[PDB]
Each structure stands twice: as structure tokens, then as C-alpha cells.
Design a protein around this ligand. Structure first.
Ligand SMILES: *[B@@]1([O])O[C]C2=C1[C]=C([N]C(=O)OC([C])([C])[C])[C]=[C]2
Length: 245
């Protein structure tokens, strides 16, 4: 392709600049990590994983028979932050809606002791979950870097995490968020509502027509009144600019 790296870099930086935030998107092609965006130093800084942790919470719960993929987690009938969460759902539906209460139930079934063992076994982020099994991914102490998130996505895309192949395939099926021509984007969003500043994530991979998998992790600051879809919009524009989709 004829486009200079200077032009790619400028373009992707401009997507973050135009959203009036600061962020980075890391793309991995084979073993090579490339960092783009308007705040490149964010790449090895630690942030809460927020709802990106649902990927690992689901792997842990399924591997340890705390749930099945068809099990319906019933709404308890209490008011929730979003009306869309006031319904009964499977893990997959809860992944797509980022329904925190379903994943809090799953975490409680797993329990603190097992959760800390599994998070250590996977070597996710700083690996510390502290003492509160139902919010450790939302308010600390668990933290992870964008480089660590893209490497996690790389591991899951290639079935390299230390879970059964079937467990990994089950969770991957929950993560399909877009199809663009013959490309599929598998990813999970994150929004750290309970930290300041608030972190936004979109971490996953592109599966191209030919079967090549290109992992990515977008990380930015979510500003007052910003819409969640900005994470998706910047990610898709960046991937399209690079010709990945
Ligand atoms: B997740 O990042 O995706 C959407 C979302 C997610 C987490 C939360 N809740 C949350 O952070 O709860 C506290 C810690 C603010 C109480 C809401 C929506």
C-alpha cells in the first residue's frame, strides 16, 4: 500500500483529537505491536479493566461450571442503572449489553478464593483482586495496561489461554460485535464509571476473510457526556484506515 506511515499516524491521531479526548489504539500483527492515537504514553499505563473483565469472568465461570452458555440469569426485579438490564439473560446476552449484575452474580458463584487463583493462573494485568469479589474489576485493585489487553485478546483469539478449547470457543461466540464485508470484529467494551478520570476500552480482534486474526485494544478517557459508541467509532475508523477492515 502507498500510504505513508506518517499519514496513517496522523489520521488515527486525528480520530482521537476530534473526539476531544486522549487515547491510544494498539494493533498486533503477528508478534509486532503498533501503537497509534494521540496519547501514546498511555500504552504501558495501568487502568481498571472495567467491563473488559467480563471476557475473563466468563472464561472462569464456564471452565469451573458456575454457569452454562444457555443458563438464563433471572432479573431479581430490582431497579437497575439501565432499563435494558431489567430482564433475564444468558451470559452471551449479558456480554453484549455489558450487564454488570449478571457478571456480579457469576463472580459471586465463583467466589473470592477461586477467582484470585484463576486471575493469578491467567496472569491478567497486575493480578490483584483484593477482598471484594463483586467489584474488583470496576474500582480497583485490579489494573491492566493497553499492551496487556491486546496481548490477552491475542491469546484468546488464538486459543492460547489456559482454559479448555471449548471454553474459549464459547466465550469467543459471545463477542461478535460487527461484520464488515467478509471481516468479523470480536470485542468487548469497557467503561470505568467508578474511577476518575473514567477509562474507556474496546479490546478484541478482527478475523479477516482469509482467517488471519488481528488483535487490538483501544484505550481512552471517557469525558462528561461522551457517548459509549465513540469507542467503537474510533476503533472502526482506525482499523479501516490501516486496511485491516
Ligand atoms: B462496563 O465497563 O461496561 C458498561 C458498564 C460497565 C460497568 C458499570 N458499572 C460500574 O462501574 O459500577 C460502579 C463501580 C460505578 C458502581 C456500568 C456500565
Amino acid at each position: 500500500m502507498h500510504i505513508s506511515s506518517q499519514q496513517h499516524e496522523k489520521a488515527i491521531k486525528s480520530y482521537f483529537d476530534a473526539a476531544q479526548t486522549q487515547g491510544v489504539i494498539i494493533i498486533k500483527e503477528g508478534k509486532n505491536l503498533s501503537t497509534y492515537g494521540n496519547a501514546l504514553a498511555r500504552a504501558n499505563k495501568e487502568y481498571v479493566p472495567a467491563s473488559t473483565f467480563k471476557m475473563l469472568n466468563a472464561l472462569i465461570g464456564l471452565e469451573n461450571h458456575k454457569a452454562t452458555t444457555n443458563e438464563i440469569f433471572k432479573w431479581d426485579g430490582k431497579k437497575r442503572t439501565y432499563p435494558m438490564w431489567e430482564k433475564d439473560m444468558t451470559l452471551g446476552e449479558a456480554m453484549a449489553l455489558s450487564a454488570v449484575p449478571v457478571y456480579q452474580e457469576l463472580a459471586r458463584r465463583t467466589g473470592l478464593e477461586l477467582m484470585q487463583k484463576e486471575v493469578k493462573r491467567v496472569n491478567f494485568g497486575n493480578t490483584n483482586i483484593g477482598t471484594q469479589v463483586d467489584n474488583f474489576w470496576l474500582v480497583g485493585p485490579l489494573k491492566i495496561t493497553p499492551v496487556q489487553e491486546v496481548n490477552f485478546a491475542d491469546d484468546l483469539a488464538h486459543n492460547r489461554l489456559p482454559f479448555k478449547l471449548e471454553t474459549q470457543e464459547e466465550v469467543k461466540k459471545m463477542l461478535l460485535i460487527k461484520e464488515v464485508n467478509g471481516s468479523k470484529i470480536y470485542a468487548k467494551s469497557g467503561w470505568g464509571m467508578g474511577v476518575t478520570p473514567q477509562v474507556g476500552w474496546l479490546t478484541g480482534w478482527v478475523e479477516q476473510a482469509n482467517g488471519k486474526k488481528i488483535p487490538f485494544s483501544l484505550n481512552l478517557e471517557m469525558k462528561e457526556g461522551m457517548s459509549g459508541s465513540i469507542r467503537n467509532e474510533i476503533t472502526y475508523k482506525s482499523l479501516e484506515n490501516l486496511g485491516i477492515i
